[PDB]
From Swiss-Prot:
Cell compartments where the protein resides: Cytoplasm
Free-text note regarding domains: The C-terminal domain negatively regulates kinase activity via an autoinhibitory association with the protein kinase and histidyl-tRNA synthetase-like domains in amino acid-repleted cells, that is counteracted by uncharged tRNAs in amino acid-starved cells. The C-terminal, histidyl-tRNA synthetase-like region and protein kinase domains are necessary for homodimer formation. The C-terminal and protein kinase domains are necessary for ribosome association. The C-terminal and histidyl-tRNA synthetase-like regions are required for uncharged tRNAs binding in amino acid-starved cells.
Organism phylogeny: Eukaryota, Fungi, Dikarya, Ascomycota, Saccharomycotina
Domain RWD, residue spans: 17-128
Designated name of the protein: eIF-2-alpha kinase GCN2
Region of the whole protein represented: 1 to 138 of 1659
Family, as annotated: Belongs to the protein kinase superfamily. Ser/Thr protein kinase family. GCN2 subfamily.
Segments passing through the bilayer: none
Additional notes on this entry: Present with 279 molecules/cell in log phase SD medium.
Organism: Saccharomyces cerevisiae (strain ATCC 204508 / S288c)
Amino acid sequence: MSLSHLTLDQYYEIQCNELEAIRSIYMDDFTDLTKRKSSWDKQPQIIFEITLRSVDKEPVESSITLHFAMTPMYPYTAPEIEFKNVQNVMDSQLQMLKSEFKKIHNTSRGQEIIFEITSFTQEKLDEFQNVVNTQSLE
């Protein structure tokens, strides 16, 4: 309807702030996937991946990788999240987080959501290992 005053370039500042903001939390638990590796800069979108997992190793480690993508419209638009590795977790936990991603974004519609999504998944994930519907041998 009205797109001129603030160009997409403005969103770059907000997106970049999330990288440095989260980087401080996962200084080591951070993964670089942007088109920067090796080269200096090509078609980077700021997007980045973060390593997540339970708090302990027993009964499992529940390790999952959350990759968030800051669309060229965000926060105007909604980013993209995808789980990787997924060992202990089967899928119920993965899909469960996706549903919560809607509530988090709705409340953070305009602000940082990388920390919210990571915290929500981390908190819920850790609590899982403690109380998970064990079954063994599917």
